């Protein structure tokens, strides 16, 4: 039942120092060795200090490690901070021949401006209309900051059934981009006279419309 | 102050090569009619040298930072005096002693002082309108200086300052360099006809000033002078013109050179000891004339290129186990002390229990224990509670460890602890442990109390009785099977390490390694260490020995300990080389034989002889060689081997 | 040096067998009772710890993937394999097969991990639909035209324009779960409107895993 | 100075004010274990002997 209690995120300015603890619920921290794993996002974890006081051959200096067993803490004490630190940290144990890692630290510093939503809208194609399927696609691109609200609208009456969106994805132009897609009948799509999709992003709301021609 | 360049297309730096150049003096004094050699730094003849470009016709313009070795070469076929000075320094930052040899139209000025040095100093020469006439006014090279003791003023040179792009017509050498502190520079002007690849004549260089600074140079730099006439905008971007100039860069290497002086006292030629096996026939003889014969100039040694130790066929241990399963334990006041000694030890069956609840092990790396050994290892056993186990550390403040065992901050020791709740204690109450709770002050580390005397609290003695002010310092446990994990019994080992002046008795030793057979190779089995070869022998050794004399009384025999195989001990390195030579006025290859050296290339009977064609043929011989065979230059032709008819 | 790399496939269904194998190349298995492990990490999640193996018939499980967790190593091959019983959704997980020497120590040699993905269904190609512009899908100067990836499986979708032409204005979207269990998602371009009619612009999407390629024109709208 | 690596060579003057390192664990210059700034104040006086 022995666990590493990690903070989620721990966010400072580059240049300062910071101090990451690992704390462990019944076993003492003293017990047993901890070792500390910087995991780039998308790649294999390395191992960032080990041995709780004596750096890996490698990486800087400025990763340092602190034990205090009174309050049952494991603490990383990382200075001077960079662009290339921004990762996950894990922190290991070993209980009694069960290996338990921690919850995970996300570095983060805390810088692309705010950004217009530009929106289109496309009508299901003829084709997929003769697959007996029909799907609108509601498109959210080039804007900052990424939090933003779908809302279909069969002309005044909303949408919620066949709804799915993607979450905001950064582009290339450090903008963020987004999508949603209605999954739809061919006979519902030619019920009602015309399919407006509305994009809500820092209040302003962007609103297009497509009808069945 | 300084301006920076901008991207362009260069050129890539070129290679060429040397023909008897980088000869100067090694010594102020005089020798007539002598050949005597030097041991200093020298070019090395026929060697590979850099060579950088200076023309426009294109915008070539390289002035790399290159290190400054032992001794550098710095040769220029210079025309229209492009070239102004060189600069010298390690970190070019204002926080050294820079130097700057740098000469201008009127004086030459040696300033060694920390000078701002910029990415890329240069000298700017500018064309006046109404003076026809080239001058220099972009004076580029440094900021400012900050402290310096050494400014030396050589002798006035007049300059040229107009650049031409037509063929050369002088070619200037320098040398420059640096022993013990003191700089040395060499020089002397050629008057030549010739773009490049430098002729082969000779020519020694001779010293102009002697520079007593005292300190050393890692680095070097060149400096160029650039016109800018009505042609160019005049802007340092990208537009200017630098002539035609070619300045070759080569590193000084210390070799034995043999120089010829005549009667005049000036160099004539130079013969090293090491590009030729020819050159090396002529040094060692101290003569320019060799004749057709043997001659014998040094040895060849086969360098082992790896070593293999193994002492034992694999990693062993000794009887234990008493110390971690035993019937009962001591306890804290008094602790059970084993001293381990002419004992192999293995810590790999240590840690594969997968039963131990706790370990810290600090000072060595808990990875790299086994193959590093120590004099003498200390067990200490005592048992502790479950709370307990973080107070075991070195710098820690508590109950139990200032009072029954101090850990020091040197320590190197090794802490193993498991849970034995199962054994080490029973229902009704296990009380059988004892450990000390009072104190009257701090104890030694690796001291034992075992001191039953009342701590006395107030002023008034008890006189050993149980009453106020008077408390037994030694107290019960609360042992008991039913409690949770906070308190349960823990067997705490402490393996501890001795630094001390004596061979490492108790040591893992290099157990087993890649065994490597008829190749000349280094190895160390347990009494001695020998370079040879280890070949399959036939003879078998009585079960009680080790190594294996011959009648020379030398060991050449020993049986390796890892399957009890006998292996041979035959040395590499037989005899020496040979150069056989034609004569002079006849040839000038050469071939090179080997004594006792097993390998164009013919096996002959007296070693290895490479270089000299194999005949069938038989003529008389005028040149020996051994066994029946000798070596002649016959029929274009060549140097042949052939056997002697009688 | 030494280098781990994993195989097996990298979908499972439900209540199935996993079969992942690591791979060691560089150095010896047998040689320095080098012990062997297996951690997982779930997306955005932290490292999971799996098992433990040594060369020898030793080996420790995780008491949350106790009675789950078959691990055999056979040193003739020199690898080792872990094998998983009821497999479930949430076992979606990235599985890096682990380094490691110190029991209590570290993951020195961490292999590249391999995306594991608990398969639904069955995997089937995909529907590809183009996105025609109009006069209202266009806002100002410039215009947008794409095309629809719908119900497709398993993952990924590479989509490129004009067999990779155009990559300016190109946005490729990450997919996302349907109302029953199958993925969606588009990849767009953005356009000037004078370069509609004047211009052809098709879509390649690739579906590797079912083997399928569809290229597929996108045009204006015909209105009917 | 009262401690060195290693023996120096005669008629050589060493400046280094790096912190001596005793074990194998560094610490990025700081009083703490297992390492000791290797310069030394001296301790003269004019009441002495
Ligand atoms: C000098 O080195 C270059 C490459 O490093 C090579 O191409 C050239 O042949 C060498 N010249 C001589 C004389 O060895
Ligand atoms: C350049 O020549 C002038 C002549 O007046 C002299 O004063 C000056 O020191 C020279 N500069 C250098 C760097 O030698
Ligand atoms: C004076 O120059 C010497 C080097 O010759 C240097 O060591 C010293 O620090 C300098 N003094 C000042 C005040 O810059
Ligand atoms: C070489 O120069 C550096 C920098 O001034 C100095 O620290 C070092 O002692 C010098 N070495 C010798 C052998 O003089
Ligand atoms: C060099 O020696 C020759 C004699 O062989 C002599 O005639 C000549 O003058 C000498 N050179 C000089 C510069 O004295
Ligand atoms: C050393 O160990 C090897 C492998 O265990 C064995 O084959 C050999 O006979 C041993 N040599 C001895 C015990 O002298
Ligand atoms: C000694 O005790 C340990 C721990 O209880 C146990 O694993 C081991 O089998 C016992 N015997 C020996 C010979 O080590
Ligand atoms: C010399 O070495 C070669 C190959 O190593 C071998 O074939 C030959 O027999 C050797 N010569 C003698 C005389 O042993
Ligand atoms: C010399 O002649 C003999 C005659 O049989 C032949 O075997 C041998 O190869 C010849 N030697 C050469 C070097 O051609």
């Given at each position: 039942n022995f666990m590493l209690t990690q903070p989620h995120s721990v966010s400072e300015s580059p240049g300062k120092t910071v101090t990451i603890s690992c704390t462990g619920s019944s076993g003492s921290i003293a017990s047993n060795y901890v070792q500390w794993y910087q995991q780039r996002p998308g790649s294999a974890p390395t191992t960032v200090?080990?041995?709780?006081?004596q750096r890996p051959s490698?990486?800087?200096?400025?990763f340092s490690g602190s034990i205090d067993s009174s309050s049952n803490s494991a603490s990383l004490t990382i200075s001077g901070l960079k662009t290339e630190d921004e990762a996950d940290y894990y922190c290991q144990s070993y209980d009694s021949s069960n290996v338990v890692f921690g919850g995970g630290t996300k570095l983060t510093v805390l810088g692309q401006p705010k950004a217009a939503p530009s929106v289109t809208l496309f009508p299901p194609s003829s084709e997929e209309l003769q697959a007996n399927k029909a799907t609108l696609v509601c498109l959210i691109s080039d804007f900052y900051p990424g939090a933003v609200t779908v809302a279909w609208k069969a002309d005044s009456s909303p949408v919620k059934a066949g709804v799915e969106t993607t979450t905001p994805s950064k582009q290339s132009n450090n903008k963020y981009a987004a999508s949603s897609y209605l999954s739809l009948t061919p006979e519902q799509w030619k019920s009602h006279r015309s399919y407006s999709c509305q994009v809500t992003h820092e209040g302003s709301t962007v609103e297009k419309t497509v009808a069945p021609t | 102050q300084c301006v920076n360049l901008t991207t362009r297309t260069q050129l890539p730096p070129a290679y060429t090569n040397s023909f008897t150049r980088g000869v100067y003096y090694p010594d102020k004094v005089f020798r007539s009619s002598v050949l005597h050699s030097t041991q200093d730094l020298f070019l090395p003849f026929f060697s590979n040298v850099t060579w950088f470009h200076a023309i426009h016709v294109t915008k070539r313009f390289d002035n790399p930072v290159l290190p400054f070795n032992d001794g550098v070469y710095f040769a220029s076929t210079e025309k229209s005096n492009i070239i102004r000075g060189w600069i010298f320094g390690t970190t070019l930052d204002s926080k050294t002693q820079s130097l700057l040899i740098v000469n201008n139209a009127t004086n030459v000025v040696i300033k060694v002082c920390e000078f701002q040095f910029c990415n890329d100093p240069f000298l700017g020469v500018y064309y006046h309108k109404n003076n026809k006439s080239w001058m220099e006014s972009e004076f580029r090279v440094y900021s400012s200086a900050n402290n310096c003791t050494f400014e030396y003023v050589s002798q006035p040179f007049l300059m040229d300052l107009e650049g031409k792009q037509g063929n050369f017509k002088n070619l200037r050498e320098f040398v420059f360099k640096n022993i013990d502190g003191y700089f040395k520079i060499y020089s002397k002007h050629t008057p030549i006809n010739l773009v490049r690849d430098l002729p082969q004549g000779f020519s020694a260089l001779e010293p102009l000033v002697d520079l007593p600074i005292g300190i050393n140079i890692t680095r070097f730099q060149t400096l160029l002078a650039l016109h800018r006439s009505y042609l160019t905008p005049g802007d340092s971007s990208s537009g200017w013109t630098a002539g035609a100039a070619a300045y070759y860069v080569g590193y000084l290497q210390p070799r034995t050179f043999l120089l010829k002086y005549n009667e005049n006292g000036t160099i004539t030629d130079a013969v090293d000891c090491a590009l030729d096996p020819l050159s090396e026939t002529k040094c060692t003889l101290k003569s320019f004339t060799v004749e057709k014969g043997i001659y014998q100039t040094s040895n060849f040694r086969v360098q082992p290129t790896e070593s293999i130790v193994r002492f034992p066929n694999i990693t062993n241990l000794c009887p234990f186990g008493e110390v971690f399963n035993a019937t009962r334990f001591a306890s804290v006041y008094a602790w059970n002390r084993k001293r381990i000694s002419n004992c192999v030890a293995d810590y790999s069956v240590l840690y594969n229990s997968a039963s131990f609840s706790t370990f810290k092990c600090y000072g060595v790396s808990p990875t790299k224990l086994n193959d590093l050994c120590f004099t003498n290892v200390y067990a200490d056993s005592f048992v502790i509670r479950g709370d307990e186990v973080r107070q075991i550390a070195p710098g820690q403040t508590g109950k139990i460890a200032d009072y029954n065992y101090k850990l020091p901050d040197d320590f190197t020791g090794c802490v193993i602890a498991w849970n034995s709740n199962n054994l080490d204690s029973k229902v009704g109450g296990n009380y059988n442990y004892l450990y000390r709770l009072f104190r009257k002050s701090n104890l030694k580390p690796f001291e034992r109390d075992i001191s039953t005397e009342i701590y006395q609290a107030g002023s008034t003695p008890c006189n050993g009785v149980e009453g106020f002010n008077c408390y037994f310092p030694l107290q019960s446990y609360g042992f008991?099977?039913?409690?949770?994990?906070?308190?349960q019994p823990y067997r705490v080992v402490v393996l501890s390490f001795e630094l001390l002046h004596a061979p490492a008795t108790v040591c893992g030793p290099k157990k087993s390694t890649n065994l490597v057979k008829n190749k000349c190779v280094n190895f160390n089995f347990n009494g001695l260490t020998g370079t040879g070869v280890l070949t399959e022998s036939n003879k078998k050794f009585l079960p009680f020995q080790q190594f294996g004399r011959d009648i020379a009384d030398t060991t050449d025999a020993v049986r390796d300990p890892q399957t009890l195989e006998i292996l041979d001990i035959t040395p590499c390195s037989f005899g020496g080389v040979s150069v056989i030579t034609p004569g002079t006025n006849t040839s000038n290859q050469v071939a090179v034989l080997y004594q006792d050296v097993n390998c164009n290339v013919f096996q002959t009977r007296a070693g290895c002889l490479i270089g000299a064609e194999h005949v069938n043929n038989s003529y008389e011989c005028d040149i020996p060689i051994g066994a029946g065979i000798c070596a002649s230059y016959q029929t274009s032709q060549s140097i042949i081997a052939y056997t002697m008819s009688l | 040096q030494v280098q781990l790399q994993e195989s097996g496939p990298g979908l499972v269904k439900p209540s199935e067998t996993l079969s992942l194998t690591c791979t060691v190349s560089g150095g010896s298995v047998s040689s320095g009772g080098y012990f062997w492990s297996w951690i997982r990490q779930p997306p955005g999640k932290g490292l999971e710890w799996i098992g433990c193996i040594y060369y020898s018939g030793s080996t420790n499980y995780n008491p949350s993937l106790k009675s789950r967790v078959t691990i055999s190593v056979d040193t003739s091959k020199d690898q080792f394999s872990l094998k998983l019983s009821s497999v479930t959704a949430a076992d979606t997980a990235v599985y890096y097969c682990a380094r490691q020497l110190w029991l209590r120590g570290r993951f020195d040699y961490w292999g590249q991990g391999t995306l594991v993905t608990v398969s639904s269904a069955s995997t089937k190609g995909p529907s590809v639909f183009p996105l025609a512009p109009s006069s209202k899908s266009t806002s100002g100067g410039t215009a947008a035209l794409g095309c629809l990836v719908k119900d497709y499986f398993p993952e990924p979708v590479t989509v490129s324009w004009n067999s990779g032409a155009l990559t300016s204005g190109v946005h490729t979207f990450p997919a996302v779960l349907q109302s029953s269990g199958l993925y969606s998602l588009s990849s767009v371009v953005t356009v000037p409107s004078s370069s509609l009619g004047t211009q052809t612009y098709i879509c390649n999407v690739n579906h590797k895993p079912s083997n399928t390629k569809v290229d597929k024109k996108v045009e204006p709208k015909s209105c009917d």
């Open positions: 200090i080990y041995e709780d006081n490698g990486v800087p200096d400025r | 008991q099977p039913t409690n949770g994990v906070g308190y | -």
